[PDB]
CSV table of C-alpha atoms in Angstrom, one decimal:
chain,number,residue,atom,x,y,z
A,1,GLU,CA,96.7,110.0,31.3
A,2,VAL,CA,94.1,112.7,32.7
A,3,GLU,CA,91.1,113.8,30.5
A,4,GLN,CA,88.7,112.6,33.2
A,5,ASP,CA,87.2,114.5,36.2
A,6,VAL,CA,88.1,112.8,39.5
A,7,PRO,CA,85.9,114.8,42.1
A,8,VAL,CA,85.6,113.9,45.8
A,9,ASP,CA,83.4,115.4,48.6
A,10,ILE,CA,82.7,117.5,51.2
A,11,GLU,CA,79.6,115.3,52.0
A,12,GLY,CA,76.6,117.4,53.3
A,13,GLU,CA,77.5,117.8,57.0
A,14,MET,CA,74.5,123.1,67.6
A,15,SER,CA,78.3,122.3,66.9
A,16,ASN,CA,80.9,124.0,66.6
A,17,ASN,CA,84.0,121.8,67.1
A,18,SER,CA,86.0,124.8,68.3
A,19,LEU,CA,88.5,124.7,71.2
A,20,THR,CA,88.5,128.5,72.0
A,21,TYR,CA,87.9,132.0,70.5
A,22,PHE,CA,88.4,135.8,69.9
A,23,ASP,CA,85.6,138.3,69.6
A,24,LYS,CA,87.1,141.7,70.2
A,25,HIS,CA,86.3,142.7,66.6
A,26,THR,CA,83.1,144.8,66.1
A,27,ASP,CA,83.1,144.1,62.3
A,28,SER,CA,84.8,141.6,59.9
A,29,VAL,CA,88.2,140.0,60.8
A,30,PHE,CA,90.3,140.9,57.7
A,31,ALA,CA,93.9,140.2,58.4
A,32,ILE,CA,95.4,137.4,60.5
A,33,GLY,CA,99.0,137.1,61.4
A,34,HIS,CA,101.3,135.2,63.8
A,35,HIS,CA,104.7,135.7,65.5
A,36,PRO,CA,107.5,133.5,64.2
A,37,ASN,CA,108.6,132.4,67.7
A,38,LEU,CA,106.0,133.7,70.2
A,39,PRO,CA,102.5,132.2,70.7
A,40,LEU,CA,101.2,135.6,69.8
A,41,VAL,CA,98.3,136.1,67.2
A,42,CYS,CA,97.4,139.3,65.5
A,43,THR,CA,94.0,140.1,64.1
A,44,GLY,CA,93.2,143.0,61.8
A,45,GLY,CA,89.7,144.3,61.2
A,46,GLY,CA,86.7,146.1,59.7
A,47,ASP,CA,86.6,148.1,63.0
A,48,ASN,CA,89.9,149.9,62.2
A,49,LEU,CA,91.8,147.9,64.9
A,50,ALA,CA,94.5,145.3,65.3
A,51,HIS,CA,94.3,143.1,68.3
A,52,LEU,CA,96.9,140.9,69.9
A,53,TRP,CA,96.2,137.7,71.8
A,54,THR,CA,97.6,134.3,72.6
A,55,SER,CA,97.3,131.0,70.7
A,56,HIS,CA,98.4,128.8,73.6
A,57,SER,CA,95.7,129.6,76.1
A,58,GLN,CA,92.1,128.4,76.3
A,59,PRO,CA,90.7,131.1,76.5
A,60,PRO,CA,93.2,133.4,74.5
A,61,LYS,CA,95.2,135.8,76.7
A,62,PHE,CA,94.5,139.4,75.4
A,63,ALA,CA,97.8,141.2,74.7
A,64,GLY,CA,96.5,144.6,73.7
A,65,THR,CA,95.1,146.7,70.8
A,66,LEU,CA,97.1,148.4,68.2
A,67,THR,CA,95.5,151.8,67.2
A,68,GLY,CA,95.9,154.5,64.6
A,69,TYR,CA,94.2,153.0,61.6
A,70,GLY,CA,92.3,155.2,59.2
A,71,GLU,CA,90.3,152.3,57.8
A,72,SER,CA,90.1,148.4,57.8
A,73,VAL,CA,93.4,146.7,58.9
A,74,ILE,CA,94.0,144.5,55.9
A,75,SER,CA,97.4,143.1,56.9
A,76,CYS,CA,99.1,141.8,60.2
A,77,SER,CA,102.6,140.7,59.3
A,78,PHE,CA,105.5,139.9,61.7
A,79,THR,CA,109.2,140.2,60.8
A,80,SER,CA,111.2,137.0,60.1
A,81,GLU,CA,113.3,137.4,63.4
A,82,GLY,CA,110.1,138.6,65.3
A,83,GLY,CA,110.8,141.9,66.9
A,84,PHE,CA,108.7,144.1,64.5
A,85,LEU,CA,105.1,144.0,63.5
A,86,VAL,CA,104.0,145.6,60.2
A,87,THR,CA,100.3,146.6,60.0
A,88,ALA,CA,98.5,148.0,56.9
A,89,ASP,CA,95.0,149.5,56.3
A,90,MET,CA,92.7,150.4,53.4
A,91,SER,CA,93.5,154.2,53.8
A,92,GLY,CA,97.1,153.5,52.9
A,93,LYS,CA,98.4,153.7,56.5
A,94,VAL,CA,101.3,151.3,57.4
A,95,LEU,CA,102.4,150.9,61.1
A,96,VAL,CA,105.5,149.5,62.7
A,97,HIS,CA,105.4,148.1,66.2
A,98,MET,CA,108.6,147.1,68.0
A,99,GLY,CA,108.6,144.0,70.2
A,100,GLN,CA,109.4,145.3,73.6
A,101,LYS,CA,109.8,143.6,77.1
A,102,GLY,CA,110.2,140.1,75.8
A,103,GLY,CA,107.5,140.5,73.1
A,104,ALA,CA,104.8,141.4,75.6
A,105,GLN,CA,104.6,145.2,74.8
A,106,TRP,CA,104.6,146.3,71.1
A,107,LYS,CA,105.5,150.1,71.1
A,108,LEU,CA,104.7,152.1,67.9
A,109,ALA,CA,108.1,152.6,66.3
A,110,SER,CA,107.1,154.3,63.0
A,111,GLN,CA,104.3,154.8,60.4
A,112,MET,CA,103.6,156.1,56.8
A,113,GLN,CA,100.6,157.0,54.5
A,114,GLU,CA,102.3,156.7,51.0
A,115,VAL,CA,99.2,155.5,49.1
A,116,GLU,CA,95.4,156.0,49.0
A,117,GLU,CA,94.8,152.3,49.7
A,118,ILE,CA,97.0,149.3,50.3
A,119,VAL,CA,95.8,146.1,48.5
A,120,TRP,CA,98.3,143.7,50.4
A,121,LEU,CA,101.5,143.7,52.5
A,122,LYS,CA,103.7,140.8,53.3
A,123,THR,CA,107.0,140.6,55.3
A,124,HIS,CA,110.1,138.7,54.1
A,125,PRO,CA,109.9,135.1,55.0
A,126,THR,CA,113.6,134.7,55.7
A,127,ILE,CA,115.3,138.2,55.4
A,128,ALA,CA,115.0,139.9,58.8
A,129,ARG,CA,113.2,143.3,59.3
A,130,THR,CA,111.9,143.5,55.6
A,131,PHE,CA,108.4,144.0,54.1
A,132,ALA,CA,106.7,145.1,50.9
A,133,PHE,CA,103.2,146.3,49.9
A,134,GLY,CA,101.1,147.0,46.8
A,135,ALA,CA,98.5,149.8,46.2
A,136,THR,CA,95.3,150.7,44.2
A,137,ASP,CA,97.4,152.9,41.9
A,138,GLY,CA,99.6,149.9,41.0
A,139,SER,CA,102.6,151.1,42.9
A,140,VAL,CA,105.0,148.6,44.5
A,141,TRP,CA,106.9,149.6,47.7
A,142,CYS,CA,109.6,147.8,49.6
A,143,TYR,CA,110.8,148.9,53.0
A,144,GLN,CA,113.2,147.8,55.7
A,145,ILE,CA,113.0,148.4,59.4
A,146,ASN,CA,116.0,149.7,61.4
A,147,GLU,CA,116.9,147.1,64.1
A,148,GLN,CA,117.7,149.9,66.7
A,149,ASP,CA,114.5,152.0,66.8
A,150,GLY,CA,112.2,150.8,64.0
A,151,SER,CA,112.7,153.8,61.7
A,152,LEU,CA,111.5,153.2,58.1
A,153,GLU,CA,113.9,152.7,55.2
A,154,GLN,CA,112.5,152.8,51.6
A,155,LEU,CA,114.2,150.5,49.1
A,156,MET,CA,112.0,151.0,46.0
A,157,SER,CA,108.8,152.9,45.1
A,158,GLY,CA,107.8,151.5,41.6
A,159,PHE,CA,104.8,152.9,39.7
A,160,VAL,CA,104.9,150.3,36.9
A,161,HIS,CA,101.4,148.7,37.1
A,162,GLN,CA,98.5,150.5,35.4
A,163,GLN,CA,95.5,149.0,37.4
A,164,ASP,CA,95.6,148.1,41.2
A,165,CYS,CA,98.6,146.0,42.3
A,166,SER,CA,96.6,142.9,43.4
A,167,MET,CA,99.2,140.7,45.1
A,168,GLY,CA,103.0,140.0,45.5
A,169,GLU,CA,105.3,137.4,46.9
A,170,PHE,CA,109.0,137.4,47.7
A,171,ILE,CA,111.2,134.9,45.7
A,172,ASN,CA,114.8,133.5,45.9
A,173,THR,CA,114.3,133.6,49.7
A,174,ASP,CA,116.7,130.7,50.4
A,175,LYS,CA,119.3,132.3,48.1
A,176,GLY,CA,120.7,134.8,50.7
A,177,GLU,CA,120.0,138.1,52.6
A,178,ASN,CA,121.6,140.3,49.9
A,179,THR,CA,119.2,138.8,47.3
A,180,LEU,CA,115.8,140.6,47.8
A,181,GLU,CA,113.5,139.6,45.0
A,182,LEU,CA,109.8,140.3,44.7
A,183,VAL,CA,107.2,139.4,42.1
A,184,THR,CA,104.0,141.6,41.9
A,185,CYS,CA,100.8,141.3,39.8
A,186,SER,CA,98.0,143.7,38.6
A,187,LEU,CA,94.5,143.9,36.9
A,188,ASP,CA,96.1,145.4,33.7
A,189,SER,CA,97.2,141.7,33.2
A,190,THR,CA,100.8,142.6,34.2
A,191,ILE,CA,103.4,140.7,36.3
A,192,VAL,CA,106.8,142.3,37.2
A,193,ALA,CA,109.8,140.9,39.1
A,194,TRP,CA,112.0,143.4,40.9
A,195,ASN,CA,115.4,143.7,42.6
A,196,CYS,CA,114.0,145.4,45.7
A,197,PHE,CA,117.4,147.1,46.4
A,198,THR,CA,118.2,148.6,42.9
A,199,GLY,CA,114.4,148.9,42.3
A,200,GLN,CA,114.5,147.9,38.6
A,201,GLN,CA,112.2,145.6,36.7
A,202,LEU,CA,114.0,142.2,36.3
A,203,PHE,CA,111.2,141.2,33.8
A,204,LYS,CA,107.6,142.4,32.9
A,205,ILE,CA,104.9,140.1,31.5
A,206,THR,CA,102.2,141.9,29.6
A,207,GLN,CA,99.0,140.7,27.7
A,208,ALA,CA,101.3,140.2,24.6
A,209,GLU,CA,103.4,137.4,26.3
A,210,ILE,CA,100.2,135.4,27.2
A,211,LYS,CA,98.5,134.6,23.7
A,212,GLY,CA,97.2,138.3,23.8
A,213,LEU,CA,94.6,137.2,26.4
A,214,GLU,CA,93.1,139.8,28.9
A,215,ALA,CA,94.0,138.4,32.3
A,216,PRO,CA,93.4,140.7,35.5
A,217,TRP,CA,95.7,138.9,38.1
A,218,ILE,CA,94.6,138.1,41.6
A,219,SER,CA,96.8,135.5,43.4
A,220,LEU,CA,100.5,134.5,43.4
A,221,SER,CA,102.3,131.6,45.2
A,222,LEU,CA,106.0,130.5,45.3
A,223,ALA,CA,106.8,126.9,44.7
A,224,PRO,CA,109.3,125.6,47.3
A,225,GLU,CA,112.8,124.2,46.2
A,226,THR,CA,111.4,120.6,46.8
A,227,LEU,CA,109.2,120.5,43.5
A,228,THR,CA,111.6,122.7,41.3
A,229,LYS,CA,115.0,121.0,42.4
A,230,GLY,CA,116.8,124.2,43.4
A,231,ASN,CA,114.5,126.7,41.5
A,232,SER,CA,113.8,129.2,44.2
A,233,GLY,CA,111.8,131.3,41.7
A,234,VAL,CA,108.8,129.3,40.5
A,235,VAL,CA,105.6,131.4,40.9
A,236,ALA,CA,101.9,130.4,40.2
A,237,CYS,CA,99.6,133.2,39.0
A,238,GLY,CA,95.8,133.1,38.8
A,239,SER,CA,93.4,135.6,37.1
A,240,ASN,CA,89.9,136.8,38.0
A,241,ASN,CA,88.7,135.0,34.8
A,242,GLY,CA,90.2,131.5,35.2
A,243,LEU,CA,93.7,131.8,33.6
A,244,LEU,CA,96.5,130.0,35.5
A,245,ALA,CA,100.1,130.9,34.7
A,246,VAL,CA,103.3,129.2,36.1
A,247,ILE,CA,106.4,131.3,35.7
A,248,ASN,CA,110.2,130.7,35.9
A,249,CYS,CA,111.2,134.0,37.5
A,250,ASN,CA,114.8,132.9,37.2
A,251,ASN,CA,114.6,132.6,33.3
A,252,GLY,CA,113.1,136.0,32.8
A,253,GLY,CA,109.5,135.0,33.6
A,254,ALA,CA,109.4,132.1,31.1
A,255,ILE,CA,105.8,130.6,31.0
A,256,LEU,CA,106.1,126.9,32.1
A,257,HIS,CA,102.3,126.4,32.0
A,258,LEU,CA,99.4,128.6,30.8
A,259,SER,CA,95.9,127.3,30.9
A,260,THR,CA,92.2,128.1,31.7
A,261,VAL,CA,91.2,126.1,34.8
A,262,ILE,CA,87.5,125.7,34.1
A,263,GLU,CA,85.6,126.0,30.9
A,264,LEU,CA,82.7,128.2,32.1
A,265,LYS,CA,79.1,127.9,30.7
A,266,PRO,CA,77.7,131.0,28.8
A,267,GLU,CA,75.3,131.9,31.7
A,268,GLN,CA,77.9,131.3,34.6
A,269,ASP,CA,79.4,134.5,36.1
A,270,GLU,CA,82.8,135.1,34.3
A,271,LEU,CA,84.0,135.9,37.9
A,272,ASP,CA,83.2,132.3,39.1
A,273,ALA,CA,86.4,131.2,37.3
A,274,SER,CA,88.5,133.6,39.6
A,275,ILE,CA,91.5,131.8,41.1
A,276,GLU,CA,91.0,133.2,44.6
A,277,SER,CA,93.9,131.2,46.3
A,278,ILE,CA,97.0,129.0,45.3
A,279,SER,CA,99.2,126.6,47.4
A,280,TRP,CA,101.9,124.0,46.9
A,281,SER,CA,102.6,120.7,48.8
A,282,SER,CA,106.2,121.1,49.7
A,283,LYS,CA,106.2,117.4,50.7
A,284,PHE,CA,104.3,116.1,47.6
A,285,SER,CA,104.7,117.9,44.2
A,286,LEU,CA,101.0,119.1,43.9
A,287,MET,CA,99.5,122.6,43.4
A,288,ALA,CA,95.9,123.3,44.6
A,289,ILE,CA,93.9,126.3,43.2
A,290,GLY,CA,90.7,127.6,44.7
A,291,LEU,CA,87.9,129.3,42.7
A,292,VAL,CA,85.0,131.6,43.4
A,293,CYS,CA,82.7,128.7,42.1
A,294,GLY,CA,83.9,126.7,45.1
A,295,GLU,CA,86.0,124.4,43.0
A,296,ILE,CA,89.5,123.2,44.3
A,297,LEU,CA,91.7,121.9,41.5
A,298,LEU,CA,94.5,119.8,42.9
A,299,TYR,CA,97.3,119.5,40.2
A,300,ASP,CA,100.2,117.1,39.9
A,301,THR,CA,103.1,119.7,39.5
A,302,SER,CA,105.1,117.3,37.2
A,303,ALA,CA,102.4,116.4,34.6
A,304,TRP,CA,100.5,119.7,35.1
A,305,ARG,CA,97.2,117.7,35.1
A,306,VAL,CA,94.3,117.8,37.6
A,307,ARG,CA,94.5,114.9,40.2
A,308,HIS,CA,91.3,115.6,42.1
A,309,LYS,CA,88.6,118.3,41.7
A,310,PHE,CA,86.6,119.4,44.8
A,311,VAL,CA,83.4,121.2,44.8
A,312,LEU,CA,82.4,123.3,47.9
A,313,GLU,CA,79.0,124.9,48.7
A,314,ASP,CA,80.4,128.4,48.3
A,315,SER,CA,83.6,130.4,47.3
A,316,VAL,CA,87.1,129.2,48.3
A,317,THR,CA,88.7,131.9,50.3
A,318,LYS,CA,92.2,130.5,51.1
A,319,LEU,CA,94.1,127.2,50.3
A,320,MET,CA,96.9,126.1,52.5
A,321,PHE,CA,99.0,122.8,52.4
A,322,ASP,CA,100.4,121.5,55.6
A,323,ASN,CA,102.4,118.3,55.7
A,324,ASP,CA,100.2,115.7,53.9
A,325,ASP,CA,97.1,117.8,54.2
A,326,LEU,CA,95.2,120.4,52.2
A,327,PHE,CA,93.2,123.1,54.1
A,328,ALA,CA,90.4,125.1,52.7
A,329,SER,CA,88.5,128.1,54.0
A,330,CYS,CA,85.1,128.5,52.4
A,331,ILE,CA,82.7,131.6,52.5
A,332,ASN,CA,80.1,129.2,54.1
A,333,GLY,CA,82.1,129.5,57.3
A,334,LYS,CA,83.8,126.1,57.2
A,335,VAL,CA,87.5,125.2,57.1
A,336,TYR,CA,87.9,121.8,55.4
A,337,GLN,CA,90.9,119.3,55.8
A,338,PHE,CA,91.9,116.9,53.0
A,339,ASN,CA,94.4,114.2,52.3
A,340,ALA,CA,96.4,115.8,49.4
A,341,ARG,CA,97.7,112.3,48.6
A,342,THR,CA,94.2,110.6,48.6
A,343,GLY,CA,91.5,113.3,48.4
A,344,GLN,CA,89.8,111.9,51.5
A,345,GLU,CA,87.9,114.6,53.6
A,346,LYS,CA,89.8,114.2,57.0
A,347,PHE,CA,88.0,116.8,59.1
A,348,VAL,CA,85.8,119.9,58.9
A,349,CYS,CA,86.1,123.0,61.1
A,350,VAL,CA,82.6,124.2,62.0
A,351,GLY,CA,81.2,127.0,64.2
A,352,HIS,CA,81.3,130.2,62.1
A,353,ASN,CA,77.8,131.3,60.9
A,354,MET,CA,79.5,133.8,58.4
A,355,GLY,CA,82.4,133.3,55.9
A,356,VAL,CA,86.0,132.3,56.9
A,357,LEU,CA,88.1,135.0,55.2
A,358,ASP,CA,91.5,133.8,56.2
A,359,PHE,CA,93.4,131.3,58.4
A,360,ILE,CA,96.6,130.2,60.1
A,361,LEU,CA,98.2,126.9,61.0
A,362,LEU,CA,99.7,126.5,64.4
A,363,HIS,CA,102.1,123.8,65.3
A,364,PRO,CA,103.0,122.1,68.6
A,365,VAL,CA,106.6,123.3,69.1
A,366,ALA,CA,107.5,120.6,71.6
A,367,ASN,CA,108.1,117.0,70.6
A,368,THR,CA,109.9,116.0,73.9
A,369,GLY,CA,108.0,112.7,73.3
A,370,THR,CA,104.2,113.6,73.2
A,371,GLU,CA,103.2,115.1,69.8
A,372,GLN,CA,100.1,117.4,70.2
A,373,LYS,CA,97.6,118.4,67.5
A,374,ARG,CA,98.0,121.1,64.9
A,375,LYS,CA,95.8,124.2,65.3
A,376,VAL,CA,93.6,126.2,62.8
A,377,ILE,CA,92.9,129.9,63.7
A,378,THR,CA,90.4,131.7,61.4
A,379,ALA,CA,89.5,135.3,60.4
A,380,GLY,CA,85.7,135.5,60.5
A,381,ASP,CA,83.4,137.7,58.3
A,382,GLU,CA,81.5,138.1,61.6
A,383,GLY,CA,84.6,139.4,63.4
A,384,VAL,CA,85.4,136.3,65.4
A,385,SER,CA,88.4,134.1,65.4
A,386,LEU,CA,88.0,130.5,66.2
A,387,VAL,CA,90.6,127.9,67.3
A,388,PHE,CA,90.4,124.3,66.1
A,389,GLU,CA,92.4,121.3,67.1
A,390,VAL,CA,92.9,119.3,63.8
A,391,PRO,CA,93.9,115.6,63.3
A,392,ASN,CA,97.7,114.6,63.3
């Protein structure tokens, strides 16, 4: 089997292939979110603002501005049932907006300023009115939103991590609404799983459990039940120095795989090995990992061997699998589309003259007969969101 590099390209290629856009941001578009059911987009930004606008219209229909941020809005996250909108900035402010008048108006329900800076905040993918966030002090917080008014409800407030709590992901999502599990990571090379309700550490991986190795963590990704066969707790972790760990959250964080992704040169920035994004093909049993050096390493989840390597002109910012395809946002300003199965560069989103920091994948809800194109909405370093019709 695999010992040989199998790279593809990314061939070297005013245009602009964009469909429509959003330029209300007067600095970088940091966060990008979308309503579960409504065609409502939410952008966060370097301008201390969160803007709402429609995905369905060319040009987007402007739905208003959410205000009260003390710094850069670094997270726009909707609730599972879509009737609440969690917002979080780099001054530690969190804001809850309640979907009013059919989801048109978004009244400010509640807010908090529990930390000095939030590093990330996601909402529960299945469990209604639930969210969690991590701070620069390494604290992990989990809250619930009251269905009536939108009053906050704290579940846990764990100060386990030593460095900044880098990222987190909910697990065992499909395993009920009374089963709130969350995995968080930090720069002190620590990974902890928690029972959001009780608030206690299920398990805690330290430097000791990983061959002693110093590994400041940066990204986490949950493997869907379709490449685990019922294991709703398989998480992929990637360090800032190239270490990739795959954990069995259900067997006390058992290390299924632990390896360096790239063998860096002496000269090469130690950072260039940073695993900036992780994603799994739900359909296919593959696991793409994106590096600062612009390398994408598509793994076969069974063998745990690299299928295809991809080199980009700049840093990978976000990897996202959709159906048969692999999408990649690069700091050059391009969003790239690949055939996960084959490696074949399907399409390239062009237009941004500054890095694409984040993205979303929109789907044609209606297959009454005619099946429209999937959409790609981006978060631009320039403070512009672009809409792209993408093949299939």
